[PDB]
Amino acid sequence: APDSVDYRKKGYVTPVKNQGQCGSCWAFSSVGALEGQLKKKTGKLLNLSPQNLVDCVSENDGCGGGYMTNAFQYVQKNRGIDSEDAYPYVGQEESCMYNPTGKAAKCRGYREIPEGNEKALKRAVARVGPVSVAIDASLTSFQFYSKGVYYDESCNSDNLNHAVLAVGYGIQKGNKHWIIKNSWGENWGNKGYILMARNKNNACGIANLASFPKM
Numbered sequence: 001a002p003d004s005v006d007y008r009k010k011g012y013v014t015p016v017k018n019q020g021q022c023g024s025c026w027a028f029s030s031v032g033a034l035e036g037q038l039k040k041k042t043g044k045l046l047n048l049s050p051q052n053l054v055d056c057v058s059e060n061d062g063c064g065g066g067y068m069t070n071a072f073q074y075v076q077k078n079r080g081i082d083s084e085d086a087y088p089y090v091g092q093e094e095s096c097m098y099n100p101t102g103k104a105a106k107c108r109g110y111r112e113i114p115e116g117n118e119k120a121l122k123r124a125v126a127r128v129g130p131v132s133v134a135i136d137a138s139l140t141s142f143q144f145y146s147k148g149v150y151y152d153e154s155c156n157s158d159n160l161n162h163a164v165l166a167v168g169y170g171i172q173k174g175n176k177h178w179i180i181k182n183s184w185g186e187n188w189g190n191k192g193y194i195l196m197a198r199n200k201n202n203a204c205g206i207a208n209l210a211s212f213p214k215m
C-alpha cells in the first residue's frame with residue numbers, strides 16, 4: 001500500500017482526448033472529473049460531452065475559455081450532462097443542443113480545494129477520485145515535455161491559463177509527482193499525460209484552482 005494512486009489502473013479515466021484549436025480545456029477537465037465520479041457511483045466508465053459544456057455553459061465563453069466550477073454548476077442546474085455519443089465534440093461553439101435522452105450523469109454540486117493546499121488535493125485525489133486542476137502551461141518546456149517529473153521554476157503559480165486533470169500521484173526516482181491527464185491528444189507528452197512535481201511549493205499553481213463534482 002505505497003502512498004500512491006493511479007485511477008487509470010482502476011478504470012476511472014477515459015482515453016486521452018484532443019481539444020484541438022478551441023479554448024475548451026476547461027470542458028475536458030470538467031468531463032474527466034465527472035467521468036471519474038460516474039464510474040465510482042455506478043461501476044460504468046464512459047465518455048461525457050465536453051461539447052455539451054462549451055455550447056451550454058453560459059457562464060463560460062465557449063472556445064474563448066472557461067472555469068470548471070461553472071460547468072459543474074451547469075450540470076447541476078441543468079439536471080444532467082449528455083454523453084459524448086449523444087453530443088459529439090465539434091471543436092467550435094454552437095447553440096446549446098442539450099438532449100434529455102442523452103443524459104449520462106448529473107451532479108449535486110461541487111467542492112473547491114482550498115487555494116494552494118497540495119495536501120488537500122492529495123487527499124481529495126486519494127479518497128474521491130480524479131480532480132480538476134488549473135495550471136500554468138504557457139512555458140515552452142511544458143509543451144515539449146516527454147518524460148520524467150516536470151518542474152520549471154519559471155512556472156507562474158499566479159498565471160493560471162490551462163485546465164487539466166489529476167488522475168493520481170506517486171514517486172518516480174525519489175521525485176514526487178501528480179499524474180496529470182492532458183487534452184492535447186495522445187501524441188503529446190507521455191501518451192497524453194505528464195507527471196508534474198508534487199510538494200515543490202505548489203509548482204505551476206497546480207492547487208490554486210482545483211475542484212470536483214459531487215454525485
Ligand SMILES: *[C@]1(O)CN(S(=O)(=O)c2ccccn2)[C@H](C)C=C[C@@H]1NC(=O)[C@H](CC(C)C)NC(=O)c1cc2ccccc2o1
Binds near residue numbers: 019065161162
Ligand atoms: C484552455 O483551452 C487551455 N489553452 S491550450 O490548451 O494551451 C490551447 C491552445 C490553443 C488553442 C486552444 N487552447 C489555452 C491557454 C487557451 C485557453 C483555455 N484556458 C481556459 O479555458 C482557462 C482555464 C482556467 C485557468 C482553469 N479559462 C479561461 O481562460 C476563462 C475563464 C473564463 C470565465 C468567463 C469568461 C471567459 C473565461 O475564460
